[model samples]
Target: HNMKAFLDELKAENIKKFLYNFTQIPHLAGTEQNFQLAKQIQSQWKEFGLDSVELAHYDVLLSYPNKTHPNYISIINEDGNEIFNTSLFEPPPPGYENVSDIVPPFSAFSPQGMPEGDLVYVNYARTEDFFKLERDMKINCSGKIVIARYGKVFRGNKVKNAQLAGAKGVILYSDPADYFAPGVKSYPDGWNLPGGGVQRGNILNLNGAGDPLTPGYPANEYAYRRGIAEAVGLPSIPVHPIGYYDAQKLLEKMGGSAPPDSSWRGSLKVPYNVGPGFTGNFSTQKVKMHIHSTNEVTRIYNVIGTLRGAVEPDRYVILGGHRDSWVFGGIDPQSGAAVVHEIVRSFGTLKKEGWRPRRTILFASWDAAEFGLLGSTEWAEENSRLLQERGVAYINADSSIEGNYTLRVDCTPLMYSLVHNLTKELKSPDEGFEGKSLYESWTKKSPSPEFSGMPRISKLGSGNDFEVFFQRLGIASGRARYTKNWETNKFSGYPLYHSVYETYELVEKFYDPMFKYHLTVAQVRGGMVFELANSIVLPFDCRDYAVVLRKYADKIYSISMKHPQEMKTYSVSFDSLFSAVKNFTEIASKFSERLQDFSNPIVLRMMNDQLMFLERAFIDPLGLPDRPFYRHVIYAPSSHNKYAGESFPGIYDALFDIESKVDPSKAWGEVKRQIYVAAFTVQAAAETLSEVA
Candidate 1:
């Protein structure tokens, strides 16, 4: 059983074939096309000689826009006669002209209705942007439609902000400043988006995670569901997303003062008007947007493939990637799906050659992930007890690559050594960095702040399939990908993200010409699953977790110092917290030494359980005050910016809320409580690992 031979067998050409095959059709969630795709994967896995293969079905809520009558925006005069209308659908790229399954560009979960009002340019429509409008310009958003550019946060959050700002409707677009950048060209030309390439995606936020109706439970056949009116996170007002082409038409018609400053300006050729109505040419007209979408309790499938382990058959290492996409998701998800398929094939090849893992490995092809991670979440919810008891780790590969430049990983500190070791051995795919390992390239790219020799591993944030495992169940989960030149380019993602232009050519021509990035990512994810499944003693490092915890604690303390008056007045003491963290650090340091003495099988099980259950101890059963599903006190997606990981999230959010309150006595009490909870959580985690005799 040569490890190198197995890894070498995972081929780039094979991944390319799978990528091309998977992206040949639009397999959006809740559609028959995606169901067929799931069936195909199940069949492929069985043929690959897996021990078992099955489709885990979930009856979840999914949103779809009108295929025939695409949602569009109309400019109507005072007499109600329409002056102009913008196309809601983008034309397919050359070879895909006949592709008819393309879902029209529309915001999912936005209420089905029409919203007509004077359009107001709110720049990015962030909470701060709305505040600037009211505070600086004395502008009111009530009864007006607000248009915002996409960047800085999740698009769904933009709509949430607009709704809270009292706007009658929300319109979002990819502003050239964020998407086009300085020199990149659109689609066939290069990496930037074309004028008419509208980014289509779901607007479901964290509140809508895991089948909105089922909430805390799985969306199985007999599961009770809440009514649509009782849904937590669906948008109440009409919202739409448009390309820069359509956005320019509306911007050209807007009237009012210039933006609060140039900082709010986008790359559009028109003036930056924070409008209350149409400009001089169309002063007599208002904008009307009709967003016709409907929700259904449809059946979506998650294909589960399992290879039984030789030793600890019950313990598992799970790898997953979403199979559903908005369009021909060449870049978004199919890249991940293809890599996953290749990994499965490679595993099957290994098993046929007389090899088995020490722990069972499950391959999950999650369906309906784009609509707030329904498949993965519901499955996790259904299997919460099994996962909490026996799951070793989760490796995720959703939208694995966006560019070919550098490596990025998001994982818990316990898995840092696992990532570091794998990257150190695997050769990089880039020509310029010939013969360099991924670790060397990553170290040269961005070294960790606390340590100069190592590359930084990011903290897991909510968005992908790892959310439920990492946050809800407190499992050691991770995602690795080759990203673009994000440091220099400073764009949100590759321009054609979530757009219809996400075709196979986008990857072949621009992103990953040779599909080497796809191949490398597949290797990374595969190697992670392999190590976690086959390692003699679990490779997790509790000391690493302690150090990272201390780093976050110090940062939070520094934040508290800025509000000295509040800290002193509210008796907010980080004294006990820091002391508790130091104690945990000492215990963890000792725990690492236990790895040297895996003397007996039962002792090994206890040691492994101690390492595995470490993260689960961070869970606060009550959850964060408002975000009940997010139970991990240490790691969570920021309530403000869902893409950014927030350390001490509950405490940070409490402080943020406390600062703005005029009468903050009640808020201050909550902040104190959160600090206490986090402090005790780590103390308990330390206790879990300390005396496993």
Candidate 2:
């Protein structure tokens, strides 16, 4: 009954006020205004009766552009004359002309340089694209600047592959297909990106999953740091991102072979070409690219507020969202940040009405997540030991409402039932759906393969604030958002990503004009948090975890069969892993069947400990192959795709490497070790469950 009252306390008007407040100030990490916002949040949490509210700081490396030397791209004619120059700044929205806080278009952590060379258009600049350019087309990118569109893969991978291919520099741009595709209209008109809009982001390889300066450890004040030269995943070549209009001009003047394969073609009107130089209209002059940015040690703050539990103060449940943004972040983070505010307010109302949770709840506003999950990574690193012992689960939200499509969720399998059940209890925000609940709309619209007409939950990947908690520390974590897809007609493509125009006006005009989606997400997140904080047995069903484990094992077996030679090189048997999965499934089944009663505190506590430790079993103390920050053995961000999740990443990454003629021995060792770790961990979880069974 108190939970229902907590849910009822969530108001759309409150959410809008929070959104407007946070979005009004551009709180980029390492800025004075961002620190002010952090303190303001701390004060608010204290006012809400949070027991402990404070700011923690980490001194980590961050990059900012030099005002004197800005990033720019120029198309040179065959006679060595500059033919076209990109307008490297987004036009500020009206009434915000004095908002000089908007940073220019540039890739963070990119080096300072001006490289002039022939430009080669390498589709998406993915590893495969580079391989095709060399093996099939016989075109070398050596000593040339590569032009790549922004989609399909992470921007860092594009620059990494270009650097590996001996390219002097790389230019990344959002393709028309992604934003200005046939049906889409440009922003300020519709929701598509305008001609001068630029997408700014960190180009550091995020597979490593933490601060570049302090790898494999916390970025504490006194922590030992590695030199810049030894920093893992930092790009060597200069990289920059530009708008599609600038890309079109450069592509049209290029002289090269015929247009690329159909898959490489975009929706742009200009004919796509593999250009080394100008063909008909101009001289064979090379393009000039310059990127001058500064790197220095700066502080990022993590604001934490604790709502103490009545029964179990040691056990913790967390809700977090990064407070930093590339620009004002009206959509990417502030939307989610506002949702966090409403969630806290709802909980505060419950507290005032004399209700307390059974487990402690921690609300965090992280900083510097835009710089490769730096703030959260550092904090998690600092509290690694305590978190491993006491952490229950983590809930993260970022870019919560790009559109009001179906509720999109990516989480561990253990969270599937909890999230599904919670969604069913909430009402759908859709207007046409009158009295229908979210579950009704979701099951009718997007049902899961597991059947039972449940909502499908995707595997968690390392793109947001959840990576450190889930991947590094082995805490079960999930993120919820209303992202764009084909099913929803409400959203258009990248209107103002990482640009000045990603402001309050855009959110109010294009996405969530009525702010109903925002309110719905807050309620949904609140419901999940409440259940996790107050449940008797942690609400975890080990059977679901066992099922997902078996699926991953099956995937490994299938891959081994397809690549028999590669598997033979590793010479590890799958039987041991299969046996472990079987043991876990059987024991988990018994535990679920007998867990109906929780009168005995000792038994209930033991059962909850075992349930919480299930996720920890996947963590290898040595961490994932080459990426120590990503320790989870099961799900990780794909090294190739960056944003998408890869189950059993070590094995798949090893297999891909072997096929590419790259030595797979090291990765194979990682695969073998992770398999053993996972199998042993499952066996241990089974043993723990048996204590109660």
Candidate 3:
């Protein structure tokens, strides 16, 4: 917390000044601000008197908001009322760009081209609805324009469903009365889609996304390449987003007598109708766009200030934070960014006082985190071999701003107990708790505080720079922060996110303005970073990993038991590997626990080196069977859900093979391979721990 106190002193003057300055920088998703921010961070790092800093560049598509396919449709009412397609209407005053007319229709990643047809209302478009709409309603939407509501699965997923159901074009809109609207819900103030706004994004089929040519390998200069079009991981749909203003118009003119069961409804102040009852005339067109923008390789920097190890500088402890932002990124990034900069300041002060860590500490401010964690991913991709050889752990810190509700920290199994020990040493900001520190307060309340006396370590997911170190490299990845009353207050997270309102003033008004808890983040992350660098034995807890694995295995097993045939295939082989991984995790846990006090300088240095290598062990030269591009076993963005985290990917993906719908037994070859990788990693860590003992 000393760092926080130090930050407190800086806040009255420097913090606010710095935040305001960043706001003016206009750090949009993929612009010069992205690069500028990284440069500014490095300069700031030097100002902290820790000079070694630089950018790590990578190729990325600066995907701009482009024009879309023009769609025009109308209904011929029985009363001779012509209902022109109003799905792309403009909003009232304070209007945003009415790009819907120019933006394409609902298309997903790598979507299939569509031929226009009559519009059919498929309520909410849930998985079950697709089937019922077909069987019960005798409504074959095949080749029809499907109109869907936007509150269900991700919009992309809905489009994916529509395509699979044989729909030609998909129209998605929010109901007039929902959370965005009042008097539409049990609570007078409810949800409603703001007029003229449609959620737009790529329906990227990321479960298999990565560099097109070098799926498993990092996209380095010397690395081999692949053609983007020839790449198999792209989405197969054309998707678009539209605001409610436009959708309401489309609905009012529909001819059908209110679709069956009134399945999907909104407070449009009108009857929900589905029809081909009116003369349905429609045409859809899309401008041809290539993947030209995605190929730009720009230089990004990774700021690293190293404190050489007394005996082993080659061994290392890595701390990271992405300096890039999406629209100034005050919350998603700056919160962490500020916390990290403070950590650097504290360490700078500590180093000046002649305090030297037993192991080298490399603190990095990364680039291109918003654009698919591009900077760090490329860094990892390019340096996998070296990282596997010399790196220890990656502890990523973003700002510690949270609601006044709860504290949440996510860590790899390797650091589960480290979190437990960490919380015990810290105090909470709230006064009522008898616990002197935040850590104690968290453990008592958070049954699953990123440490022991908790149910589980939070799963790893991607958003920031931790992607490379955690998911891609299998480095013991962890992130810090706490959420205070996120449930009751509704979190107010939706609107301002990535919007212009993400200014310092808005953050202070809507988010945590006083910035009190950010101090705690400095304490936890700073201490952990220091400890990892100085600790004699690697501070890895296999027990946490084992415990988590057991729970997952149990879930799988229970599910398998229920649907003995369909729930799981190659059950016997999977069961064996599960047991093996479980046993390995448990044994490694015990081995790690045995090396309680690794304060010895020599042991500390060796442990640091081993710590870095633990993650790399998860990678296989051959990569996953079909996902050869994804090399790390422990960390991976789900192929289906990019930017979302998946744990125990190789084993779990193989066990279910849900994507392929094949008997999992058929994929035993791949499952066995990953199990070996995980077990080997556990064994390596265990050996390192035992040696220290």
lDDT of 3 by residue, 1-693 (tens): 233333333332344455556655445444565666767777877777563665555554323333343433444343534445444322311222321222223332333343335677777776667767776667777767777876534444566677888876666665544325233321111122346444434444333334434555556667655655765334443444456666666666566545566445666754566564232342232111122112333444555566666655676778887666544455656767777777777676666666556667788776655445555666676777767677778888765564444577777767877877876676676558645766657766566534465533477765456765665556677877756543444223233333323445544544455555666666677777866766656676555666666665565445435445543454333445465566656666665554564447555445555455555655666666576546665556554334456665666666553435465455555555656665565445435434444
Pitting candidate 1 against candidate 2, the one with the higher TM-score is 1
Please report the candidate that would top TM-score against the real structure.
1
Give the winner by lDDT. 1
Model-by-model lDDT, in order?
0.87, 0.82, 0.56
Better of 2 and 3 by lDDT: 2
Quality of model 3 by C-alpha lDDT:
0.56
lDDT of 2 by residue, 304-334 (tens): 9899999998999999999998888888889
RMSD of each: 1.4, 2.4, 6.2
The Cα error of candidate 3 at residue 552, in Å, is 2.3
Q: Model 3 clash tally?
A: 72
lDDT of 1: 0.87
Model 1: per-residue lDDT, tens digit, 314-386? 9989999899999999988999989999999999998999999889999999999999899999999999999
